[PDB]
Structures are given as structure tokens and as C-alpha cells.
Design a protein around this ligand. Structure first.
Ligand code: 2ZT
Ligand code: NI
Ligand code: NI
Length: 328
């Protein structure tokens, strides 16, 4: 765990979001990509419009944010960009559904999204268990997810970083648990059951957000939606981000070959031809159902589902040989 430098949180306190962005940030399809310098500022702005200017001690908030930035490794995908991207999707979700969730829930969930991948090394859960990494000995299921949480608390336990002090002793317990549950649900392993349970609950009518066990699951699916949201952007954004994920997947695949295990095709750079059909199946198996169920549960989330459908069709388009442009 590391600390931020002097003028990083001081310069951020001076940052203010330009006019055109104010109205664009509210949209689901919005893309933070073209604005790297403004990322930590976008997050502050997002926290202030969602739970207020006095939602956190500003000084702590910045120290915390910039320390979260430093604990994202320079990997091609599971990095600072991803963190802020997923947080923004949470903001859009919360704004479209504000009164459904509490002021504790919203600050918990924005923090969870920012922190959900902390200290990722570009290696999957599968990898870490197959090669008995200590993290797999320490964390027997949801290996990385449990580590990210641990990392969050550790960052909170730094000098002047604890943004959750002014709340309570019980409320401190509650929000951490919200954040713990939120991060754990970004393990895609858990996603499949969760979505299917939520789907059965909706189609029977039994779903009740006043039921704390039902609430957790809705929040879970919210986390998944945020996590996968690269697939809800405009086609060229979606395509670009795919490059980054494969750069990560293939480097892992490279490690397995060195230890004499032929990797899964998804992680095998010599199986590039299989990318479009692979993406298709992911859309069909994971993304579609996710945004579909999430739309039923939270009707104002429909644009996510809509954009996701556009990209499936784009990938279908690539398969038929109708691909255009194709810049890298
Ligand atoms: C977030 C965003 N996108 C994701 C895409 C995923 O799958 C793509 C995929 C699947 C199978 C493949 C097989 C061969 C080549 C590429 C293949 N490519 C899997 C997980 C993802 C998580
Ligand atoms: Ni993750
Ligand atoms: Ni993630």
C-alpha cells in the first residue's frame, strides 16, 4: 500500500468540471476516455451531485481518491480507467433511481465501484488457484474480489484517509458490509446464480426491495452491470476497450504456456480469429441477460440494455465480414 504526493490532492481541490460535461455525465453511454486529466474531478463531482458537498470531508476524500489511483497497477484493463468508468455507470444508475437507495448506500456504492478492482495484477481467479498463489490459499473462493475488499479497508485505515468516521459505529459496520457485498458480487462466478434468482423473483412477483436479502441481490446485479459497462458504450469505444482486455487475457495466456499448460482459447493470442464468436457468446451468455434482468428490475436502466443490443449486432456484423474502419 502506497501514499499520494503533495500537489496531487491540492491541484484536484482546484479542479472544476466544464459546462458541456455537466449535461453529458448524466447519460449512460457517456465515455470518460477523452478526459483523463479530469477523472478524479469527475468522481468528486459525481459524489457531490449524488450525496452532497458535505457527504465527505473534502480533504479526506481527495487523499483517499488519489491513494486509490496509486493502488491500481498499470495493467492494460483492470486499471484506473476501468475503476472510474464503472463508478460512472453506478452514478448513472443511482441518479436514475435516486430515492430507491439511501445516502449510506449511495456513498457506499460509489466507493465500492471505484475500489472494486484495487491491486489487480492482470490475472484471473482461475490462474491464481491453478497455480496455488498465496491469495488462493488466503481466499478460497472469490479470490481477487476478497483481496480488493481487504485493499479497500487497508486504504481506509491510512492516516487521514478514513472517509467513513463521521457516520456512526453501527453505520460504519453497515456501509463496509454494503461495500464488502458489492465488491464480492463482481465475481462473475456468483453472477450466474444471482441473476437467475433475481429473474425468478421478478417473474413471480416476490421481489421486494424492502427485503434486505433481495436488496443485496439487486445491488449485486447493479455491480455486475457497472463492471461490464464497456459493452454499453458506442461501438468504437466498445471495440477499443476489447483490445485492452485481450492484451490482459493474452499475457496471462502467455504465462500458462511457459509452465506447459495450453491456455483456454480466450487467453490464447494465437486464437485471435475466435474473438468475434467469443464476444458473441459472452454477450449471449452474460451481458444481455444481465442488462435484461436489470431493466425489468430498474426500468430507467433500459438505455444500458439498448446499447448492449447494438453491440451484439455489431459483433454479429463482424462475423458476417461486414466490419468497417477497424482502427487500433
Ligand atoms: C468483461 C468484458 N468482456 C468480457 C468478455 C469475455 O469473453 C470474450 C471471449 C470469450 C471466448 C473467446 C474464445 C476465443 C477467443 C476470444 C474469446 N473471447 C469474458 C469476460 C468479459 C468480461
Ligand atoms: Ni474484478
Ligand atoms: Ni472490474
Amino acid at each position: 500500500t502506497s501514499i499520494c504526493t503533495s500537489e496531487e490532492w491540492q491541484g484536484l481541490m482546484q479542479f472544476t468540471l466544464p459546462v458541456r460535461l455537466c449535461k453529458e455525465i448524466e447519460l449512460f453511454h457517456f465515455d470518460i476516455g477523452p478526459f483523463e486529466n479530469m477523472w478524479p474531478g469527475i468522481f468528486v463531482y459525481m459524489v457531490h451531485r449524488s450525496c452532497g458537498t458535505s457527504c465527505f470531508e473534502l480533504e479526506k476524500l481527495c487523499r483517499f481518491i488519489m491513494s486509490v489511483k496509486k493502488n491500481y497497477r498499470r495493467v492494460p484493463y483492470h486499471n484506473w480507467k476501468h475503476a472510474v468508468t464503472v463508478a460512472h455507470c453506478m452514478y448513472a444508475i443511482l441518479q436514475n433511481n435516486h430515492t430507491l437507495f439511501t445516502d449510506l448506500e449511495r456513498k457506499g456504492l460509489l466507493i465500492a465501484c471505484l475500489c472494486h478492482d484495487l491491486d489487480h495484477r492482470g490475472f484471473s481467479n482461475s490462474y491464481l488457484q491453478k497455480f496455488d498463489h498465496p491469495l488462493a490459499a488466503l481466499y478460497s473462493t472469490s479470490t481477487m474480489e476478497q483481496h480488493h475488499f481487504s485493499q479497500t479497508v487497508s486504504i481506509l485505515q491510512l492516516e487521514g484517509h478514513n472517509i467513513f468516521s463521521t457516520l456512526s459505529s453501527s453505520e460504519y459496520e453497515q456501509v463496509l458490509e454494503i461495500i464488502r457485498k458489492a465488491i464480492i458480487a463482481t465475481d462473475l462466478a456468483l453472477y450466474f446464480g444471482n441473476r437467475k434468482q433475481l429473474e425468478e423473483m421478478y417473474q413471480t412477483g416476490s421481489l421486494n426491495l424492502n427485503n434486505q436479502s433481495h436488496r443485496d441481490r439487486v445491488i449485486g446485479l447493479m455491480m455486475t452491470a457497472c463492471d461490464l459497462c464497456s459493452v454499453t458504450k458506442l461501438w468504437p469505444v466498445t471495440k477499443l476497450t476489447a483490445n485492452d482486455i485481450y492484451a490482459e487475457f493474452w499475457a496471462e495466456g502467455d504465462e500458462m504456456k511457459k509452465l506447459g499448460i495450453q491456455p483456454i482459447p480466450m487467453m490464447d493470442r494465437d486464437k485471435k480469429d475466435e474473438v468475434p464468436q467469443g464476444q458473441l457468446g459472452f454477450y449471449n451468455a452474460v451481458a444481455i441477460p444481465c442488462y435484461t434482468t436489470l431493466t425489468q428490475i430498474l426500468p430507467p436502466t433500459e438505455p444500458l440494455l439498448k446499447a448492449c443490443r447494438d453491440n451484439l449486432s455489431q459483433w454479429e456484423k463482424v462475423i458476417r465480414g461486414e466490419e468497417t474502419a477497424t482502427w487500433i
